Every structure is written in structure tokens, then in C-alpha cells.
């Protein structure tokens, strides 16, 4: 799967900075 968490993490982290 490739750690789906990475897909969501980069989705929020971006707008988090």
C-alpha cells in the first residue's frame, strides 16, 4: 500500500505549514 498515512500526512502537513 505504501503507508496510506503518508498520502494523508502530506495532504495536511502542506496546509499545516
From Swiss-Prot:
Relatively high expression in kidney and liver. Lower levels in the spleen, testis, and skeletal muscle. Also expressed in the thymus. It is found in: Cell membrane; Endosome membrane. Subunit of the V0 complex of vacuolar(H+)-ATPase (V-ATPase), a multisubunit enzyme composed of a peripheral complex (V1) that hydrolyzes ATP and a membrane integral complex (V0) that translocates protons. V-ATPase is responsible for acidifying and maintaining the pH of intracellular compartments and in some cell types, is targeted to the plasma membrane, where it is responsible for acidifying the extracellular environment. Essential component of the endosomal pH-sensing machinery. V-ATPase is a heteromultimeric enzyme made up of two complexes: the ATP-hydrolytic V1 complex and the proton translocation V0 complex. The V1 complex consists of three catalytic AB heterodimers that form a heterohexamer, three peripheral stalks each consisting of EG heterodimers, one central rotor including subunits D and F, and the regulatory subunits C and H. The proton translocation complex V0 consists of the proton transport subunit a, a ring of proteolipid subunits c9c'', rotary subunit d, subunits e and f, and the accessory subunits ATP6AP1/Ac45 and ATP6AP2/PRR. Belongs to the V-ATPase 116 kDa subunit family. This is V-type proton ATPase 116 kDa subunit a 2. It comes from Mus musculus (Mouse). The chain holds residues 1 to 17 of 856 of the full protein.
Amino acid at each position: 500500500m505504501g503507508s496510506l498515512f503518508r498520502s494523508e500526512s502530506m495532504c495536511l502537513a502542506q496546509l499545516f505549514l
